[PDB]
Structure 1
């Protein structure tokens, strides 16, 4: 079929036939080189192109089809954030979501209005294989399982802090270890995260706590602290998200706890993928505290 339509370079001259005439110039754009090829376009196609109906039926659909090969001039190395309609999938924890997503979406509103963002927890499917396959573009957090086929970039470190409602009858900042051990706590187990070791670190330090409430995740901590005299041990970025909205106060933690490293992860296979690079750089711009 198309092998019988043969040379389509003659369809590039049919672009000069999609433009009307300009023929000696369209040759010079030569006229004898055109003449045989267009005559051959006609030996291939009965119509004398002198504009003919079916010639108009060929003129425009040729252009778009020819143009997409020229629209292809933008290489794979090209990526236009302001026009992209691509979806990016990002792995992060609930805290990661709560912290990263609002300023990201805020920035994306201007820089990439037409893209879509989807998030997931680092345990939805299998993170490694999904990132290698391109199902997940980036991951955020500690993630010690991401090693061989993965690059990583440090975004920031944040400590655990103690949080409680601002008009607490007795809680003070900076909080003493004594008061910490006398007040009542709401704790997050946070299974399979970096935050699970906290209870062990405290107990192995001889720091007893009256655990009035234990929840598996962070969603309710803000409202709980707001309406009770409980206090909580939480990551500082979470505390940052919660302080003003729930009328909460934080304090440097009276206990010795390690800080948490939050890194940006991507697979080696996409180290040079333009869209991935762009989003990566946006994350670095918004959240990296290197030059602080």
Structure 2
């Protein structure tokens, strides 16, 4: 409470995007990183040619590092960031089926029956919303032949390219993969709910001009709301 007044009393640091040499530290998952970072850096080349960016995984501690200001912004599903945090809804993950373009049998739209006949690569994606996919399919009684399981998304494009495996992936991932790896997608035959992704900042930095500048750029580039 006395903090809120002290944070308001301080003369806020000037932010000139053309001249700033500030480093912004951003927490996001490997999916957020492959999705946001290319167009973010593309925009920043034209908007703020001298700042530095670095990213990290949320899984820190994030809460404490955001209060100190060691981490500027966090993107994801971060249930623990509650008191002292502002948040804003950016976009949703929708899950699709992905497989190579000239797959011998896979169809779009894929049926639930075909989904169950084909072989899968699964992604564990521990402590993320993508991590709930396995449990969701299992609980629904949807059988999958789990031919390969990997912990993270990096190898999925090249794996699907070279095999007749299919994958359950967020559409934002699939979109970065379809052309580079000669892949197609189908809408997903199971009942997978969306994951709503938010951008988070600490209240200490709610009126920090640099922070405000960067988060508005995230809204501008990525907001679907």
TM-score grouping bracket, smaller chain normalisation: over 0.9
Cα deviation, 1:195-230, whole Å, max 9, x if unaligned, reads 121111111111100000000000000000000000
Question: What is the Cα deviation at residue 164 of structure 1?
Answer: 0.3
Question: What is the Cα deviation at residue 158 of structure 1?
Answer: 2.1
SS in 2 for 1:131: helix
Question: What is the Cα deviation at residue 238 of structure 1?
Answer: 0.6
Distance in 2, Cα, partners of 1:169 & 1:81: 51
Question: TM-score, normalised to structure 2's length?
Answer: 0.94
SS in 2 for 1:246: coil
Cα deviation, 1:100-155, whole Å, max 9, x if unaligned, reads 000000000010000000000002x2000000000000000111111111010000
Distance in 2, Cα, partners of 1:143 & 1:67: 24
**Counterpart of 2:104?**
169
Of structures 1 and 2, the one scoring higher in RCO (CA 8 A, sep 6+) is 2
Q: Of Structure 1 and Structure 2, which has the larger fraction of its residues in helix?
A: 1
- Structure 1 or 2, whichever has the larger Rg, is 1
**Counterpart of 1:4?**
none
Question: What is the Cα deviation at residue 68 of structure 1?
Answer: 29
Tell me, yes or no, if the aligned pair for 2:98 and 2:174 is still in contact at 8 Å: yes
Tell me, yes or no, if the aligned pair for 2:7 and 2:204 is still in contact at 8 Å: no
Gaps of 5+ in 2: none
Cα deviation, 1:70-96, whole Å, max 9, x if unaligned, reads 999996363100100000000000010
1:171–1:69: structure 2 CA closer, same or farther, 3 Å change rule? closer
Superposition pairs for residues 111-260 of structure 1, below 5 Å?
A: 111-123=47-59, 125-260=60-195
Structure 1 vs Structure 2 CA RMSD: 5.2
1:69–1:256: structure 2 CA closer, same or farther, 3 Å change rule? closer
Distance in 1, Cα, partners of 2:72 & 2:54: 10
Q: Of Structure 1 and Structure 2, which has the larger fraction of its residues in strand?
A: 2
Tell me, yes or no, if the aligned pair for 2:101 and 2:183 is still in contact at 8 Å: yes
Distance in 1, Cα, partners of 2:57 & 2:204: 21
Gaps of 5+ in 1: 1-64
**Counterpart of 1:86?**
22
- Larger CA deviation: 194-203 vs 246-255: 194-203
Distance in 2, Cα, partners of 1:272 & 1:76: 8
Cα deviation, 1:166-199, whole Å, max 9, x if unaligned, reads 1101101110000000000000011111112111
Which runs of at least 4 in structure 1 moved beyond 6 Å after TM superposition? 65-75
- Larger CA deviation: 243-252 vs 273-282: 243-252
- Larger CA deviation: 74-83 vs 97-106: 74-83
Question: TM-score, normalised to structure 1's length?
Answer: 0.73
SS in 2 for 1:114: coil
